[PDB]
Amino acid sequence: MLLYVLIISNDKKLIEEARKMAEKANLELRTVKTEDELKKYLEEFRKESQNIKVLILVSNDEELDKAKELAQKMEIDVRTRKVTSPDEAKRWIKEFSEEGGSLEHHHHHH
């Protein structure tokens, strides 16, 4: 199973804390800025869409809803979680590693 983590955040400290956990868990974490970059990484993951799961950690509800929409349009198997603190971002990366991504598809009726 291919486990990828994307992170939409401007806070360097939140990004670094999350990215440390990713390297320690051996998960491919990629730092996302804009919709251009979120889609640009989704483009990349299409070529190897075979038992693949992405975890997008955003800062605001703005990027939360944005990255959900982008993920569903690409139909890539993604969990979009919002974090207001680095420890929360680090938690979701730990759990996404241990479970190998659980179900987590509470709403797919779009």
Sequence-separated (6 or more) residues with CB below 8 Å from residue 48:
2
Rounded to 10 deg, the angle between the 12-25 and 86-98 helix axes is 20
Q: In this structure, are residues 21 and 90 in contact, taking their beta carbons and an 8 Å threshold?
A: yes
Q: Which residues, other chains included, contact 55 with Cβ-Cβ below 8 Å and sequence gap of 6+?
A: 3, 4, 5, 6, 78, 79, 81, 92, 93, 96, 101
Q: Give the distance, in angstroms, between the CA of residue 5 and the centroid of all CA atoms in the same chain.
A: 4
Experimental method: NMR
Report the CATH number at residue 43: 3.40.50.11230
Total residues found in the chain within this entry:
110
Complete edge-to-edge strand list for the sheet that includes strand 78-82: 28-32, 2-8, 52-58, 78-82
How many structural domains compose the chain?
1
The whole domain housing 14 covers 1-110
Partners of 89 in beta bridges? none
